C-alpha cells in the first residue's frame, strides 16, 4: 500500500485494536474479496477481542490499497465513525458512498439482511414519494403485511447518496416502534430524545411523559435536526403517530394504512405486495447457496411455492440449504409435511410456513447451542437487547456470547444492529410468536433464570447509567420477575423507597406507576394492598418525581397515611 496509508494505519493501530469487534468487519471484507476464509479463521482463534483486532490489522498491513479502503468501508458500515476518521487521513486511491454509510449508521438504520435482493420498483416508488416532501413536513407510509419486507425497504430507500444529500442533508434517524402502550411509547421516545441530543445542548433530564417528549422532539428536530428524515418502523396506532406530529418529515411502516387518520399534512402511500415473487424468492435461495438461479435444483421452485412469498421464510430455508447442501428433497418434504402445532391458531398472519421453517431450522442447530436459542424465548417484541444482558443470562464472556449469537444471526434466526462496538440483538415479531408458542411451558423458568443470573452480577441499588445494560434492567427487571411469577422478589424490588428514588430520578414515575398496576395480579391479598399504597404515593407525587431539584422521598413518604407501608419505610429511614 501507499506510505501515507501504512503510516496512517500504523499510527492508529492501538486505537483500532482497543475498540473494534472483528466479526462483522471481516464479513464485509470477505464480501469485497480482500480477505480470505482461513485469514478469518486465524483471527477468530485469537483468545480475545483485542487480539482478534491485532491479528486482523497485522494481516491488513501486508495488503494492497483496496483492502485499506474495504476495511475503511467496513468501519463506516459497522459504525466506527471516529476510527475511520483517523484512517481517512491516509486513504489511498482504489449509489452507496462513505457519506451514505456514515449517515445511516449515525441514524441507527439497520444494516442490510445477511442475504439481500433488490426490489427496485418498490424502492424507487418510496424514493419518489420522499422526494415530494421538498423540505416541508409530511408523511410517507409503507404499508403491507407482517414480514413482507417493509423495514428492509425503508432502509434501502435512504441508502442512496443523491436522495440523502438532496432531500435530507440533516440526516435520518430510525425509530423501532412496534405495538406500544403509553409507557412503552414513552420508553421509546426517551431513548430517541437521548439519541437526538448527544452533545447535550438541550436538557440533561429525560422527558417524563408523552406530552413533554412530543414537545422535546419538536425542539430537537427544529434546532438540531432540521431538513432530516425520521423513520418509524411498525406503527400500530394513530395515537402513536400524533406523538410524532411536530412539523417533521416522516417515513413510517405499518400493517394498517389507517394509522395516519389523526394526523394532517401531505400524505403519500406505498403499498407493498403481500408476497415476494417467485423469481426474487429463487434469487434469495441462489445467493444463500452460492449458485446461479438457472443452476438451482428442481426442488427450489417447489420450496418457493411452500414459502408462500414470505422473505423471512425463504431466508430461513435458504440458510438451511446453505448449511446442509445436498438435502433439497429432504427439506422440501419437511415443508410439505407440516408437523408443528399452533395453539394460538389464527392471527393477522398465516404462520404455517414460518412455523415450520423455524421448527426445522431450530431442529438443525448443533446440540450445544439449542438451549441457548431456547433461552431467547424471553426476548420481547420490539426490544433490542445489548450483549451484556446475554452475558449475564449465560454467565459467559462477551466474545463467546457474540460468537454464539452470530451463528443464529447467520441462520436468520436472530438479528443484530451494530453501531461500532455496541451490539444489540432482536427477533422479528413473527419469531417471538414462534418461540412463545414452541416453548410456552418453559417460559416461566426462563424468566426466573434471568432474574437468578441478574442477582449474581448486580443489585438493584448497584445499577448506573454508564453501564450498557442499565436501562434494560430499569425497564424490564420487574417485567421478568412478574413473568417468572417471583412475587417475593418483585415485592422486595418495588416496595422500596430506594428503588423509587433511583428509578424516578432517571425516567420519572410513569412506567413505575404502570408496573404497579400491570403486575398486581400475581400478588397475594396482603402484597396487593401494599402495592396500592405505593401506587397512590407515586400518583399523588407524580408531578414532583424525576424533576430537578429532586424531591426528598423520605419527607414525601412521611406525608403518607401512618397505615401505609410507604410511611413506615419513610419513618425508618428518617430515624436511621
Ligand atoms: N430485499 C430483501 N432481500 C432479502 N431478504 C429480505 C428482503 N426484504 C426482507 N427480507 C427478509 O425478511 C425479513 C423480514 O423483513 P422486514 O423488512 O423485517 O419485514 P416487515 O418489516 O415487513 O415485517 C428480514 O429479516 C429478512 O430476513
CSV table of C-alpha atoms and ligand atoms in Angstrom, one decimal, residues 113 115-117 119 145-152 233 284 311-312 315 415 428, ligand 1:
chain,number,residue,atom,x,y,z
A,113,UNK,CA,-30.0,-8.5,5.7
A,115,UNK,CA,-28.6,-12.0,2.0
A,116,UNK,CA,-30.3,-9.2,0.1
A,117,UNK,CA,-32.1,-8.9,-3.2
A,119,UNK,CA,-36.7,-4.6,-5.1
A,145,UNK,CA,-48.5,-7.5,5.9
A,146,UNK,CA,-46.1,-8.5,8.7
A,147,UNK,CA,-42.9,-9.9,7.3
A,148,UNK,CA,-43.4,-8.7,3.7
A,149,UNK,CA,-40.1,-6.7,3.9
A,150,UNK,CA,-41.2,-3.2,4.7
A,151,UNK,CA,-38.4,-2.3,7.1
A,152,UNK,CA,-35.8,-3.6,4.7
A,233,UNK,CA,-40.8,1.2,12.0
A,284,UNK,CA,-32.6,-15.3,-2.3
A,311,UNK,CA,-38.9,-13.4,2.5
A,312,UNK,CA,-38.2,-14.4,6.2
A,315,UNK,CA,-34.3,-16.8,4.2
A,415,UNK,CA,-30.8,-10.0,14.0
A,428,UNK,CA,-38.7,-10.5,14.2
B,1,LIG,N1,-35.0,-7.4,-0.2
B,1,LIG,C1,-34.8,-8.4,0.7
B,1,LIG,N2,-33.9,-9.4,0.4
B,1,LIG,C2,-33.6,-10.4,1.2
B,1,LIG,N3,-34.3,-10.6,2.3
B,1,LIG,C3,-35.3,-9.8,2.7
B,1,LIG,C4,-35.6,-8.6,1.9
B,1,LIG,N4,-36.6,-8.0,2.5
B,1,LIG,C5,-36.9,-8.7,3.6
B,1,LIG,N5,-36.1,-9.8,3.8
B,1,LIG,C6,-36.2,-10.8,4.9
B,1,LIG,O1,-37.4,-10.8,5.5
B,1,LIG,C7,-37.3,-10.5,6.9
B,1,LIG,C8,-38.4,-9.5,7.3
B,1,LIG,O2,-38.3,-8.3,6.6
B,1,LIG,P1,-38.8,-7.0,7.3
B,1,LIG,O3,-38.4,-5.8,6.4
B,1,LIG,O4,-38.3,-7.0,8.8
B,1,LIG,O5,-40.4,-7.2,7.2
B,1,LIG,P2,-41.6,-6.3,7.8
B,1,LIG,O6,-40.9,-5.0,8.2
B,1,LIG,O7,-42.5,-6.1,6.7
B,1,LIG,O8,-42.1,-7.1,9.0
B,1,LIG,C9,-35.9,-9.9,7.1
B,1,LIG,O9,-35.4,-10.1,8.4
B,1,LIG,C10,-35.2,-10.6,6.0
B,1,LIG,O10,-34.9,-11.9,6.5
